Design a protein around this ligand. Structure first.
Ligand SMILES: *C(=O)/C=C/N[C@@H](C(=O)O)[C@](C)(Cn1ccnn1)[SH](=O)=O
Length: 257
């Protein structure tokens, strides 16, 4: 646990780590049960739940929306107000670009934050606590439990949809394929794994310099590793440093080797 403490001192941040080798049941933990704002990592679990409810052809359904439906950061969705987008394309934009309107439209389709919460409780996640849409969910103050979870619960919930029987294999593959092709995580978990390791991740960023990455990772040979790396800082307007997540990942890899 001293390598993580030194990282917490170097980057002046609090770290939350849970890693599991699905093949050996070896874990690496550090503040595994401390709450952090989940931020955009919730996008992964939201698509997890959508996949539970929608058939593949349901995903071809066109969703119309307006300029007023758009929020702060909509890289894909703002470009398609006139024509709408299929659920499939919204999931793609939400996961790989972290498009906030895409997320919000998907969350509405599943019934809103309380419905997402209920579905997570059903799969045994008693920790994750969604209450809000994007971008307001990204802002969580100290001591608050709204829109928070833990390294352990995020990893376990991600593990549930991507690797266990919470989704049938084809839908697992679809989720994994989107997350493999994520565009926002090059400097995080991806930067901390050895050459030839495959990564499917979702990133998050929030107030208090909160910087998260959750992933399934595959060594060259062997079973996948489930990893959540969460972080926050003590000032509301703090900047995060991606190098903290990359280095923490390197510690996880070393400890698992
Ligand atoms: C999901 O994690 C999306 C996060 N968006 C952040 C960000 O990228 O830092 C925005 C754009 C800015 N931000 C950070 C903290 N509070 N606002 S916004 O969508 O929250």
């Amino acid at each position: 646990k001293d390598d993580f403490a030194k990282l917490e001192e170097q980057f002046d941040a609090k770290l939350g780590i849970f890693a599991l080798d699905t093949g050996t049941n070896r874990t690496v933990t550090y503040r595994p049960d401390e709450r952090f704002a989940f931020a955009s990592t919730i996008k992964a679990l939201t698509v997890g739940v959508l996949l539970q409810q929608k058939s593949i052809e349901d995903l071809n359904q066109r969703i119309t929306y307006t300029r007023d439906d758009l929020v702060n950061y909509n890289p894909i969705t703002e470009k398609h107000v006139d024509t709408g987008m299929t659920l499939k394309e919204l999931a793609d934009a939400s996961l790989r670009y972290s498009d906030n309107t895409a997320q919000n439209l998907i969350l509405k389709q599943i019934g809103g934050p309380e419905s997402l919460k209920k579905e997570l409780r059903k799969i045994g996640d008693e920790v994750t606590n969604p209450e809000r849409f994007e971008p307001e969910l990204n802002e969580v103050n100290p001591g608050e439990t709204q829109d928070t979870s833990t390294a352990r619960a995020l990893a376990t919930s991600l593990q549930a949809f991507a690797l266990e029987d919470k989704l049938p294999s084809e839908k697992r593959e679809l989720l994994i394929d989107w997350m493999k092709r994520n565009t926002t995580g090059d400097a995080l978990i991806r930067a901390g794994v050895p050459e030839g390791w495959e990564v499917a991740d979702k990133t998050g960023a929030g107030s208090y310099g909160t910087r998260n990455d959750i992933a399934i990772i595959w060594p060259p040979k062997g079973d996948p590793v489930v990893l959540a790396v969460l972080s926050s800082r003590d000032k509301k307007d703090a900047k995060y440093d991606d190098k903290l997540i990359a280095e923490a990942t390197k510690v996880v890899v070393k400890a698992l080797n």
